Amino acid sequence: IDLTQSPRTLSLSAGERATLLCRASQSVSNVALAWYQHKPGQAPRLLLHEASTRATGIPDRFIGSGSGRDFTLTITSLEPEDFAVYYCQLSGRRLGQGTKVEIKRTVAAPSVFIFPPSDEQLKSGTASVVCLLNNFYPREAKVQWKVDNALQSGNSQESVTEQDSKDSTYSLSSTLTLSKADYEKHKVYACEVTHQGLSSPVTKSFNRGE
Amino acid sequence: QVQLQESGPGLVKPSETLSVTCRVSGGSLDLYYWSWIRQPPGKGLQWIGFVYFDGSYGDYDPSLRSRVTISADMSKNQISLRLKSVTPADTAVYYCARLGPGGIFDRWTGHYGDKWLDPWGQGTLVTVSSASTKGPSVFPLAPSSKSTSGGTAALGCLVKDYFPEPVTVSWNSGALTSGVHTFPAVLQSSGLYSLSSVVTVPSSSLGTQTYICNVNHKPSNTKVDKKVEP
């Protein structure tokens, strides 16, 4: 006996109604179904049990309904605070694949900064250039590493934040790591950023020695 | 007012036995089930098993039942999960929680309370590797004039080449929380996690307020502080 959630992914502007489905392989009584909100880095919390009985202390905008095999978590009006992944489970507690819920919002352009490699890290024989994309939306963006106007590959590596629970923007970090031998055979280390919120792509760059 | 926290080894070697312990800190185990839920690095909440508080009845995910046993010391108020023959598959954050319907007590015939999972609590990460731990090398992300964008400046620390997760980064010993994005670690092809952590602050405060990041890596008993200066 199994448990099927859908959609797997859901991007909705703040304040709109969101509907989440959890579908059993079989007939089940209301009692054994429960809903869980799992914000990233917190511990997962009970939203609802016995399919409709609201958990203690969780707001009214979370409503639960259903019978038989189609169970339905309803967010009547999304608050940005709802960015999470919402799971469901049966009695002896096995399942739910969940539903990652963005908060869709306005296009917001990233603010960009570069940081040169530190004096301390250069003494160890490795140079790291870090490029920053801060508080932007929608999630997708392009970082292009340009070293004396030449493109990089495979020695840049990047990470992006989980969605900010209050203004629903994303922040991104692209780190270029080279050995000091490589860092010094070029002069100008440049980071070019492409995003919806940016008219044309922006480039922030320094010349080795500053 | 119940509350609980899991803890355990920060690392396990291949083919060993992984254990994790959960300690109930607001009430007793009395008349409840206690269950274990794992979240692998990319996946959702895999259920592992639960055990009745008194230890007579338990149920587990049959994928793991052969290599899983869960016990509870009603006196110590702690529950132990014991997963044999661990592989890097089992590399995951292990969550601990409290099963259900009010639980209610049952005989040996009918164990017919089980309904919901209330308090969960952060639970603990267990990497599983034959590698040996390494310490962070913390450097400054200096707010140079290429990090001066009008009246706001950005600055941070680089936390490079460590193992295994986690590290804790804090700013000015907990004082600074606004404008903090401590990024996710990125597992390099070397096998090592690496991470920056940034804070944006007013340009005017650069010469008045000093900024120091507090990196902490319990798997190597590394704690460094690094001042950020021009």
Q: Which domains does chain A have, with CATH numbers?
A: 1-105 (2.60.40.10), 106-208 (2.60.40.10)
Whole-angstrom distance, CA of residue B141 vs CA of residue A71 = 49
Regarding whether B119 and B38 lie in a shared domain, the answer is: yes
Whole-angstrom distance, CA of residue B139 vs CA of residue B225 = 10
Whole-angstrom distance, CA of residue B147 vs CA of residue B154 = 6
User: What residues make up the domain containing B126?
Assistant: 1-130
Q: Is A60 on the interface with B (CB under 8 A)?
A: no
Instruction: Please classify residue B136 by burial: count the beta carbons closer than 10 Å to its beta carbon, then call 0-12 exposed, 13-18 middle and 19+ buried.
Output: buried
- The 3 state secondary structure assigned to B123-152 is CEEEEECCCCCECCEEEEECCCHHHEECCE
Listed residues B130, B158, B188: the one ending a domain: B130
C-alpha pair distances (Å), A84 with each of A40, A73, A95, A164, B220: 7, 13, 17, 11, 32
Listed residues B110, B130, B150: the one ending a domain: B130
Residues with Cβ within 8 Å of A100's Cβ and at least 6 positions away in sequence, in order, are A8, A9, A10, A85
Peptide bond before residue B88 is cis, with ω within 30 degrees of 0: no
Regarding whether B30 and B58 lie in a shared domain, the answer is: yes
Whole-angstrom distance, CA of residue B126 vs CA of residue B91 = 6
Q: Record the tokens describing residue B25, joined without a space.
A: 């800190």
Q: Is A90 on the interface with B (CB under 8 A)?
A: no
Tell me, rounded to whole angstroms, the distance of Cα B2 from its chain centroid.
Answer: 20
For residue A159, which residues of chain B lie inside 8 Å, CB to CB? Answer: 183-186, 195
- Closest-CA residue of B relative to A174 is B196
Contact B47 A93 (CB under 8 A): yes
Whole-angstrom distance, CA of residue A99 vs CA of residue A74 = 12
Place of tokens 């707001």: A59
- In whole angstroms, how large is the CA radius of gyration of chain A? 23
For residue A38, which residues of chain B lie inside 8 Å, CB to CB? Answer: 45
Residues with Cβ within 8 Å of A168's Cβ and at least 6 positions away in sequence, in order, are A14, A80, A83, A102, A103, A104, A105, A137
Regarding whether B117 and B15 lie in a shared domain, the answer is: yes
The closest CB to that of A43, out of B35, B50, B122, belongs to B122
What's the total number of domains in chain B?
2
Residues with Cβ within 8 Å of A205's Cβ and at least 6 positions away in sequence, in order, are A114, A146, A188, A189, A190, A191, B146
Contact B184 A159 (CB under 8 A): yes
What are A172's strand-pairing partners? A133, A160
Experimental method: X-ray
Residues with Cβ within 8 Å of B151's Cβ and at least 6 positions away in sequence, in order, are B202, B203, B204
Contact between B163 and B190 (Cβ < 8 Å): no
- Closest-CA residue of A relative to B36 is A93
Place of tokens 């979370």: A62
What are A126's strand-pairing partners? A179
CA angle A154, A160, A165 (to 5 degrees): 175
Whole-angstrom distance, CA of residue A163 vs CA of residue A186 = 36
**Helix (H) / strand (E) containing A181:** helix A180-183
Instruction: Please classify residue B23 by burial: count the beta carbons closer than 10 Å to its beta carbon, then call 0-12 exposed, 13-18 middle and 19+ buried.
Output: middle
Whole-angstrom distance, CA of residue A209 vs CA of residue A181 = 15
